[PDB]
RNA sequence: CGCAUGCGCCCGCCGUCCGGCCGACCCGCAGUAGGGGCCGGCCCCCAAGGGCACGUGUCGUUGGCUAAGUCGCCG
RNA sequence: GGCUUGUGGCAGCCAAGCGUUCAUAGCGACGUUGCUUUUUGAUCCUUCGAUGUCGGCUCUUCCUAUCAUUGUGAAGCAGAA
RNA sequence: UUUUUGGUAAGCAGAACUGGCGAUGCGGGAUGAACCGGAAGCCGGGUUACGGUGCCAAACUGCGCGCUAACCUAGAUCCCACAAAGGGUGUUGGUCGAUUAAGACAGCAGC
């Protein structure tokens, strides 16, 4: 059952500076600008004058539910280079403090102390990320950035950088984990 | 023009006998590829539904059926009994064609295609020409549409005819919707 | 059915066949890769082996047993005098691999080096480059020699120098035949390196240019030869019960 | 596929987005009619399934091996030319002579090197990409399979297309400046060619 | 953002089969894979959209009009000027009268290409060596 | 122009010997296959039908002044769909025959 | 890349003589849920299904002249 | 060696019950579906103008239904095991 | 093939009717005494059977509809060279019932 047309439509903010071709989206805003290939995606991107318009013809199931994954990629683009988007991480011990140190102008963290351990975990934010300890939270990470799949991404390397092993993980609930998804 | 399923009505009857010299007449539409198969196919029915053998049974007309208007759309419900692998099993059919021999051609084509059901597994229980208002079938009501506007997403390349067939060409073919 | 008992096999299957090498001067079958950031500077050496003795130092290791404390252990002795650059050759990078595109040699060729392009030196004419030092000697040869460098600058993507040892030094060899292999030369740009080569033509690189005290360094060669052997000693195999 | 017919002295395929065994399958009938092939941009042949259904069916080819001496073949060519090769000798009786000679007729080259770079490449509907395979369906090119099974040019391949194709793009340029000066040359004959225009107008697109 | 749509009024190309050349109009669609055509010089009649090549051209109808109406639709639009006049429709009547010519037809027209080539060759010249 | 040496005229147009009628598993040799170019139906080979083919090869000894030799034969009837036709000769062509060209001459005309 | 045989060998010519062609003309790249050309509007595509070429003479008659153009050969 | 797989070996499904509580952490009664040819039988197709008939020694290669080693999930996994 | 006894079973053993092989090539089933077609003097032409028409390899990458996407070697033709119970919010059809513009469902809000 191909239902002949799937549509589904978004309105661009004013003061963003959207320009679609080839189903190649630049998106242009006052913190920078954001691109994604969507060329691996079979439908109709059209801008209408200011809205964004996708449309999928005779489509399955499977294929019109692309229509909304579009949008809201689409979407994230344009409140990174409006709003930001701001990951708070939190450090979680029980006995032995969790040491990190920021270096390389904020685009690095090292993790020293996990569970006692003497090897030194080092991660590399993304491009367009950078990592700054909280002042006004006690042991709090924040990570900034305009792509919210690239600050995503940074907070997930550090979560399972810190992962326990030979342990039972329901006591032992050491780790640096994401305890708030908002934007800056 | 060429249909490979035409509709017939098929009239039998029982021999005459002296207790009953006037026997019940049978009328039937059934579908076949031609007037021959036709008939068998009202033998097999009469058999086993009115108990009334060819052997002791009497052919009395057979005339095929035509569309009325070949010209338009219509839609056709068609209700049907088919055996799959492990029983028998009832289901309601619609289709969009000019003929309800078209749709019946589709029908078979589609439970062949859907359910590995052969042409010989299926009972035709009841055709009819369905309004759209009362249509059931999604596949069918997208299309009752004034407005019914859609491009052609797939579409095929290849010359008119094979004469202008070359295994070369200094080009890929230029598509566009 | 599964063998009684399981130990692991004799030998390595890495190193077949086990032949006579096609060669006996050791062959680089790869050199260092190439840091651009460094100057030029040549990455093998050519050296005879003298012989073994053995030295006695204080180790430095510490958390080790031998910390503060001698040990002895036998060196080898490798006679490296220094060698003569005599030519350059540029390679191309193809899809085919490494291509070589031209040879550059240098005005004088010594004795030494002329001998190895021949069977019977003495018996020959010795014309080995003879009509080649000519065209040194003209105006319009000594640009055409200029324009094979300006051509290798310009296409080349690796550079190798052709050098040979100075083994009439070493009169315990007993041979004139001097050795020539090609060296190449890492770091800088194309044209530095050509004009790396070119400039070292009928000069001597000593080996304190190539290597240094206390690196790691690779060996290559041909072991001792020993004939036809048996499984026994050539693969290490046990040998059968007595009777 | 009875074969193209045509006379040529040498034919000049462009692989670009050609599936394997479509291609494979026309270019062995065309050798075996006694025509002469040249194959170019075999790293950018395309085959269905994707990368991983791909790999997987190679490195099941690089399971078979004669035990006893993995020298006498099979023998498992990682370059997108021999490749091609290898699968256009699958759909030829290589083994008898007619077969050998047809092989020997047919080149295939990564890239496109000279002469062939100044030479009219065609193309191959009934084995394009475009016409053969539903967009969407997972597929993957010969080069980028190759590389991962031991194939170490794919770099230097495509610096070298690079360098050709805006080498191409100049040429370009030229012709389509010549044409633009071609353009007034017609206009300015117009006035001497009143009779032959008119004959040819009826016929002119 | 598509160029061509099938509806009602579409001018359609049949592109395969024994009518290939001629134009149909799409008064009504059957399904994805079929509509109804009707042309002023045959019966109306069901197609598949794989036999059709859809064009600019699109009167204004209504679904499945009379043939009386239709014909005066696609001469109040010039449906047959407006195709022959353009490049498409173009290409299909010259490659007819291509291979409608004859052998003398032929050789006057291989006169006329090659005196036109040789005056077209002279002024490319004169713009080369004035406009270098 | 091209000072070109060669025939002036050219009254023929090449065909393919594509190999004999056979099965999968036999071969007649009394029979060719051969592909006209430009013939890609069974209806375009209507026009062919009869017309007189010449399989032109060259010998190493000359005779009556000459190394080539030429066999004679004519299409007989369409072979499939796509154009193809087969052909009898005086003698059955040589299997080295196959991937040659033939010469398909124009006559005998009907028209 | 070096060196290459004096009654030999290698080249540039001229003849002598020996073992599949018939216009065998043609370099854009890229995309195909698009790509260009012109002033958001209007056009082009929708197969080389094109274009180019004395393409015209017994593989081509004799004797001249020959503007430019095209083509081959040659430093 | 081949067919077969009763027997031998290995595996799954249902969930009565066991598991302090708690069908399913770990187990699976009563039943029921399979796999394997490293057991033994059944058969007698090949070999009786002969295929050298136990085991060990030696030596290579192969399988996975994984004993240890690398990376992980689960637990009636605090740690250790 | 079918009926049929012993046996867990067997390319096992034993009967019933007919055909086949053995004594027989030939086309198809890649390959095969028995399966499918079909039985034959030596030849030319025509047409078929079974089986086929992307290449190997004679005949369509023919004209149509749908289904499938296999990160297990997806699957691919009587005999025939295997696979089961039991499962999947994979996907596609169908059957019965329930709810919904008097406002359902999800989320949100304070029934
Ligand atoms: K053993
Ligand atoms: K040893
Ligand atoms: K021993
Ligand atoms: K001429
Ligand atoms: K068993
Ligand atoms: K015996
Ligand atoms: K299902
Ligand atoms: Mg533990
Ligand atoms: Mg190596
Ligand atoms: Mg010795
Ligand atoms: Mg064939
Ligand atoms: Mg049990
Ligand atoms: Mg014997
Ligand atoms: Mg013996
Ligand atoms: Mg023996
Ligand atoms: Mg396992
Ligand atoms: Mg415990
Ligand atoms: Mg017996
Ligand atoms: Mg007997
Ligand atoms: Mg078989
Ligand atoms: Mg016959
Ligand atoms: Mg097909
Ligand atoms: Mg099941």
Redesign the interface.
């Known amino acids: 059952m191909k239902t002949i047309l799937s549509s589904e439509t978004m309105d661009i903010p004013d003061g963003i500076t959207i320009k679609v071709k080839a189903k190649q989206i630049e998106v242009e805003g006052p913190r920078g600008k954001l691109t994604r290939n969507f060329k691996h995606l ?1 439908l109709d991107f059209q801008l209408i004058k200011k809205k964004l318009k996708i449309d999928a013809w005779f489509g399955s199931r499977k ?1 019109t539910a692309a229509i909304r994954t579009a949008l809201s990629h689409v979407e994230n683009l344009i409140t990174g280079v409006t709003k930001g988007y701001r990951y708070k991480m939190r450090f979680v011990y029980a006995h032995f403090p969790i040491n990190a140190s920021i270096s390389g102008g904020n685009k690095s963290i090292e993790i020293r102390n996990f569970l006692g351990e003497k090897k030194v975990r080092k991660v590399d934010m993304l491009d367009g990320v950078t990592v700054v300890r909280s002042e006004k939270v006690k042991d709090e990470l924040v990570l900034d950035g305009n792509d919210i799949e690239l600050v995503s991404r940074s907070a997930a390397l550090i979560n399972q950088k810190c992962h326990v092993k030979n342990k039972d993980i329901r006591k032992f609930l050491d780790g640096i984990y994401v305890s708030e998804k908002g934007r800056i | 023009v060429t249909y490979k399923f035409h509709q017939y009505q098929v009239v039998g009857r029982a021999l005459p006998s002296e207790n009953d010299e006037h026997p019940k007449i049978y009328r039937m539409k059934l579908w076949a590829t031609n007037e021959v198969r036709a008939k068998s196919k009202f033998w097999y029915f009469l058999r086993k539904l009115k108990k009334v053998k060819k052997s002791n049974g009497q052919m009395l007309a057979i005339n095929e059926i035509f569309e009325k208007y070949p010209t338009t759309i219509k839609n056709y419900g068609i209700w049907l009994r088919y055996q799959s692998r492990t029983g028998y099993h009832n289901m309601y059919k619609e289709y969009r064609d000019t003929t309800l021999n078209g749709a019946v051609e589709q029908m078979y084509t589609e439970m062949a295609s859907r359910h590995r059901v052969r042409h010989h597994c299926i009972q035709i229980i009841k055709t009819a020409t369905i309004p759209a208002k009362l249509c059931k079938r999604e596949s069918t009501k997208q299309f009752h549409d004034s407005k019914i506007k859609f491009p052609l997403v ?1 579409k095929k ?1 290849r010359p008119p005819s094979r004469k202008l067939k ?8 230029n ?1 566009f919707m | 059915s599964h063998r009684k008992f399981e130990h692991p096999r004799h030998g390595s299957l890495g190193f077949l066949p086990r032949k006579r090498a096609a060669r006996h001067r050791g062959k680089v079958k790869a050199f260092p890769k190439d840091d651009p950031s460094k100057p030029c500077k040549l990455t093998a050496f050519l050296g005879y082996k003298a012989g073994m003795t053995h030295i006695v130092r204080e180790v430095e290791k510490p958390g080790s047993k031998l910390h503060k404390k001698e040990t002895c252990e036998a060196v080898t002795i490798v006679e490296t005098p220094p060698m003569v650059i005599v030519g350059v050759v540029g390679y191309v ?5 490494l291509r070589c595109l031209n040879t550059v040699w240098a005005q004088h060729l010594s004795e030494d080096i002329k001998r190895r392009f021949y069977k019977n030196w003495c018996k020959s004419k010795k014309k080995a480059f003879l009509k080649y030092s000519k065209k040194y000697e003209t105006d319009e040869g000594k640009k055409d020699i200029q324009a094979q460098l300006e051509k290798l600058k310009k296409y080349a993507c690796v550079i190798r120098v052709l050098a040979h040892t100075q083994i009439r030094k070493m009169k315990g060899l007993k041979q004139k035949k001097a050795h020539l292999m090609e060296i190449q030369v890492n770091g800088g740009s194309i044209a530095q390196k050509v004009d790396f080569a070119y400039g070292f033509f009928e000069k001597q690189v000593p080996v304190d240019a190539v290597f240094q005290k206390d690196e790691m360094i690779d060996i290559i060669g041909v072991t001792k030869g020993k004939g036809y052997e048996g499984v026994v000693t050539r693969w290490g195999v046990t040998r059968l019960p007595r009777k | 596929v ?6 040529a002295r040498r ?1 000049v ?1 462009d692989a670009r ?1 050609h599936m394997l065994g479509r291609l494979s399958s ?1 270019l062995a009938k ?1 050798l ?3 025509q002469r092939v040249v194959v170019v941009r075999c790293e950018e042949i395309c085959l269905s399934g994707g990368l991983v259904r791909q790999k997987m069916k190679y490195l099941r080819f690089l399971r078979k091996r004669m035990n006893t001496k993995p020298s006498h073949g099979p023998i498992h060519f990682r370059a997108p030319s021999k490749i091609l090769w290898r699968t256009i000798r699958g759909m030829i009786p290589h083994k008898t002579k ?1 077969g050998a000679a047809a092989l020997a007729r047919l080149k295939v080259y ?2 496109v ?1 000279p002469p062939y770079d100044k030479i ?1 490449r ?5 084995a ?1 990409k ?2 053969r395979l ?3 369906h997972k597929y993957c090119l010969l080069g980028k399979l190759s590389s991962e099974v031991g194939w170490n ?1 794919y770099d ?2 495509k610096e ?1 297309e690079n360098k050709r194709k805006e080498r191409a793009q100049v040429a370009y340029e030229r012709r389509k400046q010549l044409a633009k ?2 353009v ?3 206009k ?2 117009e006035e ?2 009143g ?3 008119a ?2 107008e ?4 | 953002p598509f160029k061509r749509f099938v509806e009602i009024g579409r001018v359609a190309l049949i592109n395969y089969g024994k009518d290939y050349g001629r134009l149909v109009v799409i008064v009504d669609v059957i399904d994805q894979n079929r509509a109804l055509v009707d042309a002023p010089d045959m019966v109306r009649s069901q197609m598949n959209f794989k036999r059709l090549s859809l064009t600019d051209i699109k009167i204004d109808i209504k679904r499945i009009p009379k043939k009386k109406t239709l014909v005066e639709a696609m001469e109040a639009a010039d449906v047959k000027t407006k195709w022959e006049n353009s ?1 498409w429709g ?2 299909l009547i ?1 490659q007819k ?2 291979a409608a ?1 004859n052998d003398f037809d032929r050789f ?2 291989m006169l ?2 090659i ?2 080539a040789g ?6 010249a004169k ?2 060596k004035i ?1 270098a | 122009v091209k000072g070109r040496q060669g025939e002036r005229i050219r009254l023929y147009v ?3 010997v ?1 190999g004999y009628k056979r099965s999968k598993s036999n071969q007649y040799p009394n029979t060719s296959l051969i ?5 890609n139906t069974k209806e375009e080979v209507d026009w062919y039908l009869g017309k007189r083919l010449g399989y032109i090869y060259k010998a190493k000894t000359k005779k009556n002044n000459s190394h080539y030799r030429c066999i004679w034969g004519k299409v007989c009837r369409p072979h ?1 769909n ?3 036709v087969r052909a009898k000769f005086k003698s059955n062509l040589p299997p080295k025959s ?4 033939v010469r398909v001459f124009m006559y005998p005309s009907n028209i």
Do not use: C, W
Not at chain 4, 2 to 7: A, E, M, W
Not at chain 5, 119 to 124: A, C, F, T
Not at chain 6, 98 to 101: H, L, N, Q, T
């Open positions: 079979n294929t | 797939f390349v070359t295994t070369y060409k200094a080009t890929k073919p598509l | 990078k193809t899809p085919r691999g | 009875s074969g193209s017919g045509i006379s034919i395929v987005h026309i065309e075996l009619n006694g007619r990564e890239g090197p009219k065609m193309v191959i509907p009934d394009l475009v016409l539903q967009s969407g040019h230097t391949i070298l000066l071609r007034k040359a017609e300015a004959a001497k060619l009779p032959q225009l004959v040819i009826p016929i002119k697109y | 490049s173009r290409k010259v009268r291509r010519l006057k027209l006329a290409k005196k036109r005056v077209v060759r002279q002024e490319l713009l080369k406009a | 090449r065909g393919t594509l592909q006209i170019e430009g013939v499939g796509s154009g193809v196959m991937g040659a060209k």
